[PDB]
Design a protein around this ligand. Sequence first.
Ligand code: HEM
Ligand code: HEM
Lengths: 145, 146
Amino acid sequence: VFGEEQEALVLKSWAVMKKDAANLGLRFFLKVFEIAPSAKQMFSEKNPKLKTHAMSVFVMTCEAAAQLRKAGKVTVRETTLKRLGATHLRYGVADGHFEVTGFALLETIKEALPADMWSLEMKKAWAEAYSQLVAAIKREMKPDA
Amino acid sequence: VVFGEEQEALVLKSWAVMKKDAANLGLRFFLKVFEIAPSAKQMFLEKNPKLKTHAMSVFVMTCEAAAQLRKAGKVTVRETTLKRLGATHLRYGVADGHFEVTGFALLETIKEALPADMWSLEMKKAWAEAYSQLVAAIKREMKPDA
Ligand code: HEM
Ligand code: HEM
C-alpha cells in the first residue's frame, strides 16, 4: 500500500539531509540520549562508529521504503536481517529502544530539514518505513515461530 | 587444573564407551534436564529426533572441547561457530542457570551410563571442565566483547 509519493517523500528529504550527515547523526544521537540516557551504556562525541550507525539507520530506512513500494514488504537480504537481529539482541536493544529511536528520528528530521519540506505526510512516511524495518529486525531477535 | 593429556583421555575413553548407546543416552540426558527445570521445555517428547540431535551436539562438542583445550589452549569453532552458538542460545533465552542445570544433568547422566569402575572424581572433573569451558566460550558471544 506504500505509495510512490511516500517513497518519494523519504528519498527527497534524504537527498537533502545526507549533505550534512555527520552532524545529522550527531543530532540523532544526542536526542536519543536526551530521552533515554541509559542507552549510552549500550555503546562504549565524534565517535565514528556512532556516525556509521546513524547513517546505517537512515540508509536502511530509505531502503525499506524502496522495498515497501516494490514488494509491499521489507525484503532485506535474509542474512543481513539475521545478523541485525543478533547484534541488537546481543547488545540488549528492546522494544523501548527501537521506539525512542524512532521518535528521535522524526524529531531529528524535523529539526534538520528545511521547514518548508516538513509536514504530516512526511512524518508518517519516515514513521512507516522505520517501523517496518524494526519489525523485520525484531523477527530475527526471537524464535522463528 | 589446566586441561592436559590425562583429562582428555578420560573424556575420550568414556565417550567411546557411551557413544555405543548415544540415542538412549541423549534422551536420558535431556529428560533429566526437563525434570530439574520443566520451564526449559518451552525453549524448544521422548520420540522427538530434534531433541536427540541437540543432546548429541552437547556431548560431541564437549568431547571436542576436550581435545582443543589440550591441543590449543582453548575451545574451537568446529562443525559451526561460537558466534552462531552464542546467537542461537541468546535468541532462545538460555541463561547461565540453564547451562548449569544442563551440566549437572550431564555429569549425572554420565555417572549412570558408565561402568562404576570407570567413574571417578577425576572423571567427573574432566567432563565438568571441558563442559564449563565450552559454555564459557559460547556465553562470550552472547555479550559484547569486553
Ligand atoms: C532499525 C534501526 C536500526 C538499524 C537499521 C540498525 C543498524 C545497525 C547496524 C548495521 C549495525 C552494525 C552491526 C552488524 O554488522 O551487524 C548496528 C549495531 C548496533 N546497533 Fe543498531 N540499528 C538500528 C537500531 C538500533 C537501536 C534502536 C539501538 C539501541 C538504542 C541500536 C544499538 C546498536 C548497537 C549497540 C550496535 C553495536 C555497535 C556497533 O555496531 O557499532 N541499534 N546497528
Ligand atoms: C555447551 C552446551 C550446548 C551446546 C554445545 C549446544 C549446542 C547447540 C547447537 C549446535 C544448536 C543448533 C543451532 C546452531 O547451530 O546454533 C543448539 C540449539 C539450541 N540449543 Fe543448545 N547447546 C548447548 C546448551 C543448551 C542449553 C543449556 C539449552 C537450553 C536448556 C539449549 C537450548 C537450545 C535451543 C532452544 C536451541 C534451538 C533449537 C531449535 O531451534 O529447535 N542449548 N544448541
